[PDB]
Design a binder for this molecule. Structure first.
Ligand SMILES: COC(=O)[C@H](Cc1cccc(C(N)=[NH2+])c1)[C@@H](C)NC(=O)c1ccc(-c2cc[n+]([O-])cc2)cc1
Ligand SMILES: [Ca+2]
Lengths: 234, 52
């Protein structure tokens, strides 16, 4: 995360972190249930073998709330395309259930119609993760969060150098130095409605980070709710 | 009108059925007796920042 603030205690409990065989977090995720983690399909390519870590806020001290979980099943979108990043969604079924505690709780999955008309029309959403802090900087040891404004579809389609498929939406700033970044992908994009946070996106990609004239691109989760729904019953 | 007017007074999901508002909640919540508020079914409901 570029800019934004540090996730304080119990603030971003749905954040999950994909770690490689060498214990380095390479992508993020969103706790959906005791057994399911929602992430980006393009992430299932960033490591030979990987696991899921929840409850982590500082990759430099074993606080105690953490928990590493093994993935039993990884459900990638059949139509995922690596060239365009279209259909960038995936579900991970963990071998053992997640025990909800402080800094470990799931994010709510909204209903499509309500979400797009009432949730995605809100001023902002929240993006978090341990990704880089600067477009050219090392990854973060602290879990960060960023309030990212919803960007008009047209102004976004215009601002992007590549195609903004119907499975993508934009959030971020045009000039302001705040945006998600590498390492944050797969991570959660939620929207708060009356003290309750709903999953509304998946950190997908962007041209660099916090670039002027560019935004952050997220998977339109509302477009895959029946899919996520299905993947969670298999 | 309806769900367009302050989410129809629903805590979460709002649905307009037959020119009226019908409220609902995510999994882990149950519609309150007033038919609008959402009550957590157990500890650590979804979308709630952990207070303890
Ligand atoms: C430092 O830079 C980064 O980390 C970037 C990745 C990235 C990951 C997560 C969030 C953001 C963001 N919101 N800015 C950005 C960086 C490595 N990525 C890019 O240059 C980059 C990403 C996609 C495409 C691309 C190419 C072809 N199609 O058809 C669609 C998209 C081209 C360049
Ligand atoms: Ca830690």
């Amino acid at each position: 995360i570029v800019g934004g603030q540090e996730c304080k205690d119990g603030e971003c409990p749905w954040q999950a972190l994909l770690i490689n065989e060498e214990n380095e977090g390479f992508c993020g995720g969103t706790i959906l249930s005791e057994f399911y983690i929602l992430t980006a399909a393009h992430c299932l390519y960033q490591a030979k073998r990987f696991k899921v870590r929840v409850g982590d806020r500082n990759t430099e001290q074993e606080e105690g709330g953490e928990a590493v979980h093994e993935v039993e099943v990884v459900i990638k979108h059949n139509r995922f395309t690596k060239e365009t990043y279209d259909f960038d969604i995936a579900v991970l079924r963990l071998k053992t259930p997640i025990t909800f505690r402080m800094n470990v709780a799931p994010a709510c999955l909204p209903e499509r119609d309500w979400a797009e008309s009432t949730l995605m029309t809100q001023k902002t959403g929240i993006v978090s993760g341990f990704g880089r802090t600067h477009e050219k900087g090392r990854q973060s040891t602290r879990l960060k969060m960023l309030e990212v404004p919803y960007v008009d579809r047209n102004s976004c389609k215009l601002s992007s150098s590549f195609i903004i498929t119907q499975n993508m939406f934009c959030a971020g700033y045009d000039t302001k130095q705040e945006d998600a970044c590498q390492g944050d992908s797969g991570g959660p994009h939620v929207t708060r409605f009356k003290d309750t946070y709903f999953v509304t996106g998946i950190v997908s990609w962007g041209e660099g980070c916090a670039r002027k004239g560019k935004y952050g691109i997220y998977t339109k989760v509302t477009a895959f709710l029946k899919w996520i729904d299905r993947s969670m019953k298999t | 009108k309806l769900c367009s007017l302050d989410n129809g007074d629903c805590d979460q999901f709002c649905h307009e059925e037959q020119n009226s508002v019908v409220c609902s909640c995510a999994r882990g919540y149950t519609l309150a007796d007033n038919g609008k508020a959402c009550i957590p079914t157990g500890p650590y409901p979804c979308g709630k920042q952990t207070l303890e």
